[PDB]
Amino acid sequence: SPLMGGFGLKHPPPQILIKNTPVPANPSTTFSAAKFASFITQYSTGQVSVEIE
Amino acid sequence: SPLMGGFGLKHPPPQILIKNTPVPANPSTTFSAAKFASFITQYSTGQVSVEIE
Amino acid sequence: QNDGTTTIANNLTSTVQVFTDSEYQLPYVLGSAHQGCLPPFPADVFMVPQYGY
Amino acid sequence: DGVGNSSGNWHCDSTWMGDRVITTSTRTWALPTYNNHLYKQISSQSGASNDNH
Amino acid sequence: DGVGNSSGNWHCDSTWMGDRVITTSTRTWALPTYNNHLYKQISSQSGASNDNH
């Protein structure tokens, strides 16, 4: 039993992981094998709903 | 009977409640547990129709 | 951000990517009493925490 | 459903059937964001008279 | 599915059936881009105490 309190679970509710997909900004007209350091600045938002029985 | 006049109802027409959902504006790149004080300023509009028999 | 002003616009084609690990293959951060929970009061807006291990 | 499809038409009209009558009305509304998205406690001010608290 | 269609509704509510109880809650979130899209190594700083590495 967790020492902070609550229900010890071998298989707890899984972790939900979320990311904003990268959106490159204006590549150069000539090829470069280097990594992209420049992206469109941006974020996201929305609603999340949890129902426990 | 209402003293202003009209029809007293135990179960009147219900209240219709409406809200603009918040749209946060540009969160910081590092995590902060504080509440959001900054939102996109905005409003809405549309049409409403009522039919009574 | 141009000069001292900031513009925010929809990017309609951008994606957000989401997975849940049901096989428990990542370090499990939950249950360490970290902050960034869904707020107690439903009208609050919260920032999503960053994942690290 | 869509960005370019109307969700409904304008019904404002009255029909008298000799026993019933149906009065339909449509209006256009505008909905600000009140209290900058958040609930607030309100109360009477200070030395307001006892009747007005 | 669409730009002008809602993906889901706001469910925040609680029902007590006398044996079970279901608590549903919905919130609004905001998701920055952390670490400017890239993973990073992190470690304790220099002369931090042995307990804190």
mmCIF file with all atom_site columns, C-alpha atoms in Angstrom, chain D residues 2-47:
data_model
loop_
_atom_site.group_PDB
_atom_site.id
_atom_site.type_symbol
_atom_site.label_atom_id
_atom_site.label_alt_id
_atom_site.label_comp_id
_atom_site.label_asym_id
_atom_site.label_entity_id
_atom_site.label_seq_id
_atom_site.pdbx_PDB_ins_code
_atom_site.Cartn_x
_atom_site.Cartn_y
_atom_site.Cartn_z
_atom_site.occupancy
_atom_site.B_iso_or_equiv
_atom_site.pdbx_formal_charge
_atom_site.auth_seq_id
_atom_site.auth_comp_id
_atom_site.auth_asym_id
_atom_site.auth_atom_id
_atom_site.pdbx_PDB_model_num
ATOM 1  C CA . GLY D 1 2  ? -19.795 22.622 -41.626 1.00 0.00 ? 2  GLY D CA 1
ATOM 2  C CA . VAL D 1 3  ? -18.143 25.990 -41.907 1.00 0.00 ? 3  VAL D CA 1
ATOM 3  C CA . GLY D 1 4  ? -20.080 26.898 -45.045 1.00 0.00 ? 4  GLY D CA 1
ATOM 4  C CA . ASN D 1 5  ? -23.476 25.434 -44.173 1.00 0.00 ? 5  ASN D CA 1
ATOM 5  C CA . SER D 1 6  ? -26.204 27.304 -42.351 1.00 0.00 ? 6  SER D CA 1
ATOM 6  C CA . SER D 1 7  ? -27.305 25.612 -39.138 1.00 0.00 ? 7  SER D CA 1
ATOM 7  C CA . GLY D 1 8  ? -30.889 26.833 -39.370 1.00 0.00 ? 8  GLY D CA 1
ATOM 8  C CA . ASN D 1 9  ? -33.233 29.292 -40.985 1.00 0.00 ? 9  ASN D CA 1
ATOM 9  C CA . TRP D 1 10 ? -35.028 32.410 -39.790 1.00 0.00 ? 10 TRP D CA 1
ATOM 10 C CA . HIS D 1 11 ? -38.445 31.521 -38.398 1.00 0.00 ? 11 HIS D CA 1
ATOM 11 C CA . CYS D 1 12 ? -40.405 34.520 -37.172 1.00 0.00 ? 12 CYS D CA 1
ATOM 12 C CA . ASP D 1 13 ? -44.116 34.179 -37.797 1.00 0.00 ? 13 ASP D CA 1
ATOM 13 C CA . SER D 1 14 ? -47.510 33.623 -36.187 1.00 0.00 ? 14 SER D CA 1
ATOM 14 C CA . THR D 1 15 ? -50.290 31.196 -37.127 1.00 0.00 ? 15 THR D CA 1
ATOM 15 C CA . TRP D 1 16 ? -53.834 31.368 -35.754 1.00 0.00 ? 16 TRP D CA 1
ATOM 16 C CA . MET D 1 17 ? -55.640 28.038 -35.981 1.00 0.00 ? 17 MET D CA 1
ATOM 17 C CA . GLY D 1 18 ? -58.777 29.122 -34.116 1.00 0.00 ? 18 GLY D CA 1
ATOM 18 C CA . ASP D 1 19 ? -58.115 27.126 -30.955 1.00 0.00 ? 19 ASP D CA 1
ATOM 19 C CA . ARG D 1 20 ? -54.356 27.275 -30.628 1.00 0.00 ? 20 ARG D CA 1
ATOM 20 C CA . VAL D 1 21 ? -51.945 29.944 -31.781 1.00 0.00 ? 21 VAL D CA 1
ATOM 21 C CA . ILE D 1 22 ? -48.220 29.507 -32.447 1.00 0.00 ? 22 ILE D CA 1
ATOM 22 C CA . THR D 1 23 ? -45.907 32.499 -32.139 1.00 0.00 ? 23 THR D CA 1
ATOM 23 C CA . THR D 1 24 ? -42.402 31.922 -33.496 1.00 0.00 ? 24 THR D CA 1
ATOM 24 C CA . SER D 1 25 ? -39.664 34.528 -33.172 1.00 0.00 ? 25 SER D CA 1
ATOM 25 C CA . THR D 1 26 ? -35.995 34.659 -34.124 1.00 0.00 ? 26 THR D CA 1
ATOM 26 C CA . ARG D 1 27 ? -33.367 37.172 -33.007 1.00 0.00 ? 27 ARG D CA 1
ATOM 27 C CA . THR D 1 28 ? -29.642 37.827 -33.302 1.00 0.00 ? 28 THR D CA 1
ATOM 28 C CA . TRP D 1 29 ? -27.542 37.842 -30.128 1.00 0.00 ? 29 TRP D CA 1
ATOM 29 C CA . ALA D 1 30 ? -24.030 38.754 -29.001 1.00 0.00 ? 30 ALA D CA 1
ATOM 30 C CA . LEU D 1 31 ? -22.228 37.080 -26.097 1.00 0.00 ? 31 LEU D CA 1
ATOM 31 C CA . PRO D 1 32 ? -19.231 38.731 -24.406 1.00 0.00 ? 32 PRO D CA 1
ATOM 32 C CA . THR D 1 33 ? -16.901 36.932 -22.019 1.00 0.00 ? 33 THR D CA 1
ATOM 33 C CA . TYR D 1 34 ? -18.017 37.957 -18.556 1.00 0.00 ? 34 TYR D CA 1
ATOM 34 C CA . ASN D 1 35 ? -15.721 38.358 -15.525 1.00 0.00 ? 35 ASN D CA 1
ATOM 35 C CA . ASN D 1 36 ? -12.740 37.475 -17.721 1.00 0.00 ? 36 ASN D CA 1
ATOM 36 C CA . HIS D 1 37 ? -13.723 33.767 -17.589 1.00 0.00 ? 37 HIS D CA 1
ATOM 37 C CA . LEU D 1 38 ? -13.796 33.422 -13.792 1.00 0.00 ? 38 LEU D CA 1
ATOM 38 C CA . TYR D 1 39 ? -16.388 33.287 -11.014 1.00 0.00 ? 39 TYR D CA 1
ATOM 39 C CA . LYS D 1 40 ? -16.426 36.018 -8.386  1.00 0.00 ? 40 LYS D CA 1
ATOM 40 C CA . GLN D 1 41 ? -17.867 36.638 -4.949  1.00 0.00 ? 41 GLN D CA 1
ATOM 41 C CA . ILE D 1 42 ? -20.115 39.698 -4.783  1.00 0.00 ? 42 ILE D CA 1
ATOM 42 C CA . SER D 1 43 ? -21.638 41.374 -1.747  1.00 0.00 ? 43 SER D CA 1
ATOM 43 C CA . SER D 1 44 ? -23.161 44.661 -0.674  1.00 0.00 ? 44 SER D CA 1
ATOM 44 C CA . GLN D 1 45 ? -20.762 47.519 -0.032  1.00 0.00 ? 45 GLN D CA 1
ATOM 45 C CA . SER D 1 46 ? -19.662 48.376 3.481   1.00 0.00 ? 46 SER D CA 1
ATOM 46 C CA . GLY D 1 47 ? -22.088 50.750 5.167   1.00 0.00 ? 47 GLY D CA 1
#
